[PDB]
C-alpha cells in the first residue's frame, strides 16, 4: 500500500533518532499516568519523525570514488590522478612540508581542523593554520618532545618534554609547566570534560583538570609501561594498550581497569576507536590487527594482517581507517559497518599511500575535510582521500569556520557545561537511572539442605553463638 | 487594558495597535524601564496600524490650533471612523489611548463604543505613549518621507506666528 513508506520512515527514525526502545503504554495501570505517558510517546514519536524529515536540509555531500571498469581497482589510484580529477580548493590542501633535520614529526589537528600542530622529536614544535598557510607559532625547545596536543581551542597547546608537560599560549609563550606529570609519554585531551590525561613511562595515568588546575585522579596502572593510548570519543574512557598484549579500559573513578580486552600476543602497537563508540581497531606487534565491537565487548571479525607492526592507526569520521605501518600507510574502507549485525572481512584496502623511504610516525585525519596528514621522518605530508570526512558538521558543537566572537562564546559555553569527572562510565547515558538498592530499601521502610551446612561451616569460625545459629543447629539436628 | 492608541506628531497622526500590553503593577520596575528604553523590546509591544499625514502646512496649522485648544478635527474623526471597529458600547467596547483628557472626552462623545484613556490620568498609557514618543523616528521610518526635525521646526514657527500675529507688526528689517 501507500502507507508502507510511512511505516518504513517511522522504523528508520525510531532506529536512528529514537535513543531507546519505546514506553509500553498498555502496562500502565494509573489513568493520569497512562494519558500523560501516551502524550509523551506521541511527542517523542513526532520528535524523531521531524528530525528525520529535517535531515534533508543538509547542504554538503559525502565524497567518494568508485571504480568504473572491471579491471580498474580503487587502491591503484594515484594522487596525481586524484588532484587532476578533483576541485581546486581541495586540491590546494595536498601539500608536503620538508623538515628533515629535527626528528620524526608528530601531527595533531585541532578538533575543528583549523590549526595543526606538528612536533619533531628533537624539539621543533610548530603550530600553523594549514589552509590559510600562516603559522601561529614555531619554537625549538631544546630537549626531546614526546607528544604535542591541542587543548580545547587552538589557543593553548601542551607539549610533553623530556620530564614534564608544558602548556603554551597561541604565540608560543609558555604559560606553565606541570610538575606532577613527570616523564609523560602519552597524552589525550577529553574535549567535553576539560581533563588532560597523561600516561607516564612508569605506567601512571594522571587526569588534570585544565580549567581549574587540579589533578583529579592519579591512577597507577599496576602492570608494565604502556605502549599506546587512545580515547573513546563517546564514553570519554581511555583505551590504553599494554605490553603483555591486552588493552585496558580506564576511567578516573576506578583504580582497577574497567574491562581488559585480550588482544595480540606481543604488545599492541596502536589503537583507534570510533567516534560513535562502536568499534575499536588495534594493531599489535604480532603482525595482526583486529577490530572489536565495543558495545558488546567481543571480536567482530578475524584478524587482518598488516605486513609490518603498525606504528599508528586512526579512523575517520566516516568508516575509513588509515593504518600506518613501517614506511607507507594503507586506508581500509569497510571494516565495521554499523548496520550489519555480523561483520564481513574486506578483501582489498581502499587506497594505499606510497612507500618511498619515509618511515611513518603518526597518521591523523583532518576532522572535517577529506584529507589525511601523515607525519613521518622527513616532515609532514598531507594527502587527499575522497571518501573520508564528515560532510555535514553542526555549527553548535564544532565549526571549521569559527569567527573570533563565535570562538569566545563557544569557549564560555563549553566552560559552563564542562562535565564533572565522576560522570564517566562505559555507558555515558546513566544519569537519572535507578539506584536499585536504595529503591528496594525505600520500599522496605515504606511497607514496614545444601546451603545450611556451609552456613554452619562459615559461622563455626567466629565463634559468636548468635541465636540464628542456634536455630540453624536445631534445624541441622532435625535434618 | 489598551487596544489601540492615538499618537499625533508634526508630520501627521498615527494610531498604533498594542499587542502584548504593558504590565501595570511593575511599571516602576527597572527591568520594565529597560524594556521601555530598548527599541528591540518595545517594538514587540507596539505595531503600527494606521498613519494619516497632513495635506499641507495649513492643515497642520489648523490641526495644532484645534488639538491644543482641545477640539478634535474632522479628519481625525475620519481616520478614527476608518480604523476603529464600528461599535456602540452596549456589549463590547474598544479602549483607545490618547494623550489629552479633553480629546479623550470628545472622542468618547463622538464614538460611544470607544472608551478613551488619557495619558494625564493613566500611568500605563502614559508610559506607553512615552515609549512611542521616544522611538517615534524608527517606528515610522518606513513611511516617514524625509525627517521630523524640519517639520517640527516649521510647524512650531507657524503655530507661534499664528498665535502671536508676528508678521503684521514686525517690520523693521
Amino acid at each position: 500500500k501507500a502507507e508502507l513508506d510511512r511505516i518504513r520512515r517511522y522504523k528508520q527514525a525510531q532506529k536512528k533518532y529514537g535513543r531507546g526502545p519505546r514506553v509500553d503504554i498498555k502496562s500502565v495501570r494509573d489513568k493520569k499516568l497512562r494519558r500523560t505517558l501516551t502524550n509523551l510517546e506521541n511527542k517523542y514519536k513526532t520528535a524523531a519523525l521531524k528530525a528525520k524529515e529535517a535531515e534533508i536540509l543538509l547542504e554538503n555531500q559525502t565524497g567518494f570514488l568508485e571504480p568504473e571498469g572491471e579491471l580498474e581497482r580503487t587502491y591503484k589510484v594515484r594522487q596525481d590522478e586524484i588532484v587532476k580529477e578533483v576541485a581546486v580548493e581541495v586540491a590546494q590542501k595536498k601539500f608536503e612540508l620538508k623538515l628533515t633535520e629535527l626528528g620524526p614529526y608528530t601531527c595533531e589537528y585541532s578538533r575543528n581542523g583549523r590549526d595543526l600542530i606538528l612536533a619533531g622529536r628533537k624539539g621543533h614544535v610548530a603550530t600553523m593554520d594549514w589552509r590559510e598557510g600562516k603559522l601561529g607559532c614555531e619554537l625549538q625547545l631544546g630537549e626531546t618532545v614526546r607528544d604535542a596536543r591541542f587543548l580545547h581551542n587552538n589557543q593553548f597547546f601542551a607539549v610533553a618534554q623530556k620530564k614534564y608537560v608544558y602548556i603554551y599560549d597561541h604565540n608560543g609563550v609558555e604559560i606553565h609547566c606541570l610538575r606532577k606529570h613527570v616523564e609523560v609519554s602519552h597524552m589525550e585531551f577529553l574535549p567535553y570534560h576539560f581533563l588532560l590525561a597523561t600516561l607516564s613511562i612508569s605506567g601512571q595515568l594522571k587526569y588534570q583538570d585544565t580549567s581549574t588546575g587540579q589533578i583529579v585522579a592519579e591512577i597507577a596502572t599496576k602492570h608494565g609501561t604502556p605502549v599506546s593510548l587512545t580515547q573513546n570519543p563517546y564514553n570519554a574512557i581511555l583505551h590504553i594498550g599494554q605490553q603483555n598484549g591486552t588493552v585496558t579500559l580506564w576511567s578516573p573513578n576506578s583504580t582497577d581497569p574497567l574491562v581488559k580486552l585480550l588482544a595480540h600476543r606481543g604488545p599492541v602497537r596502536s589503537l583507534a576507536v570510533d567516534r560513535e563508540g562502536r568499534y575499536m581497531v588495534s594493531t599489535g606487534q604480532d603482525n595482526k590487527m583486529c577490530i572489536w565491537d565495543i558495545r558488546n565487548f567481543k571480536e567482530a571479525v578475524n584478524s587482518y594482517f598488516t605486513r609490518a607492526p603498525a606504528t599508528s592507526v586512526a579512523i575517520s569520521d566516516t568508516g575509513l581507517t588509515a593504518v600506518g605501518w613501517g614506511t607507507h600507510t594503507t586506508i581500509w574502507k569497510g571494516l565495521f559497518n554499523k548496520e550489519r549485525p555480523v561483520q564481513v572481512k574486506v578483501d582489498s584496502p581502499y587506497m594505499t599511500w606510497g612507500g618511498q623511504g619515509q618511515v611513518v610516525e603518526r597518521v591523523r585525519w583532518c576532522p572535517f575535510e577529506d584529507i589525511l596528514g601523515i607525519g613521518h621522518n622527513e616532515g609532514f605530508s598531507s594527502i587527499i582521500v575522497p571518501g573520508a570526512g564528515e560532510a555535514n558538521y553542526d555549527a553548535l558543537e564544532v565549526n571549521p569556520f569559527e569567527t573570533k566572537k563565535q570562538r569566545q562564546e563557544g569557549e564560555v559555553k563549553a566552560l559552563l557545561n564542562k562535565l564533572q569527572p565522576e560522570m564517566i562510565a562505559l555507558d555515558p547515558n546513566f544519569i537519572g537511572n535507578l539506584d536499585l538498592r536504595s529503591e528496594k530499601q525505600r520500599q522496605a521502610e515504606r511497607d514496614l539442605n545444601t546451603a545450611l551446612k556451609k552456613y554452619l561451616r562459615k559461622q563455626r569460625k567466629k565463634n559468636i553463638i548468635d541465636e540464628k545459629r542456634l536455630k540453624a543447629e536445631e534445624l541441622y539436628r532435625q535434618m | 487594558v489598551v487596544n489601540f492608541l492615538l499618537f499625533e506628531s508634526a508630520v501627521g497622526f498615527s494610531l498604533f495597535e498594542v499587542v502584548h500590553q504593558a504590565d501595570t503593577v511593575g511599571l516602576e520596575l527597572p527591568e520594565v524601564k529597560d524594556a521601555m528604553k530598548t527599541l528591540d523590546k518595545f517594538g514587540k509591544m507596539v505595531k503600527l496600524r494606521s498613519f494619516n499625514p497632513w495635506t499641507s502646512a495649513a492643515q497642520g496649522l489648523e490641526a495644532i490650533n484645534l488639538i491644543s485648544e482641545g477640539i478634535m478635527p474632522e479628519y481625525l474623526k475620519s481616520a478614527l471612523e476608518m480604523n476603529l471597529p464600528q461599535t456602540s458600547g452596549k456589549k463590547s467596547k474598544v479602549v483607545l489611548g490618547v494623550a489629552d483628557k479633553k480629546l479623550a472626552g470628545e472622542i468618547t462623545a463622538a464614538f460611544p463604543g470607544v472608551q478613551c484613556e488619557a495619558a494625564d490620568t493613566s500611568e500605563v498609557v502614559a508610559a506607553l505613549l512615552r515609549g512611542i514618543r521616544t522611538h517615534a523616528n524608527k517606528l515610522h521610518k518606513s513611511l516617514q518621507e524625509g525627517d521630523i526635525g524640519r517639520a517640527q521646526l516649521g510647524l512650531g514657527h507657524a503655530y507661534s506666528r499664528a498665535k502671536v500675529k508676528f508678521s503684521v507688526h514686525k517690520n523693521d528689517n
Binding site: F156, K163, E174, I175, H176, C177, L178, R179, K180, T210, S211, T212, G213, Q214, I215, Q408, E409, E411, V412, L415, L416 | -
Partner: protein, 60 residues
C-alpha cells in the same frame, strides 16, 4: 576567553586558564625572567638544592 559575566563568573569561581595552584604564583617564571636564567630546568635544580639545604637546617 572573554571577560566572564556576573552569573558566568559566579558559576566559574574557581576557574582561570593561566595561573593554577600548582604553578605556585608563577614564582619560577618570575625568577627565571628576572635573573635571565636560560633554563627552567636550572631553576628547578637550584630549587631542589635549596630545599635539601633547608631541610638540613630544619633537622639541625
Amino acid at each position: 576567553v572573554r571577560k566572564l559575566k556576573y552569573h558566568e563568573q559566579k558559576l566559574l569561581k574557581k576557574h582561570d586558564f593561566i595561573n593554577y595552584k600548582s604553578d605556585n604564583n608563577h614564582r619560577d617564571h618570575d625568577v627565571i625572567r628576572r635573573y635571565m636564567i636560560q633554563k627552567p630546568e636550572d631553576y628547578h635544580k637550584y630549587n631542589r638544592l635549596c630545599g635539601s639545604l633547608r631541610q638540613f637546617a630544619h633537622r639541625l
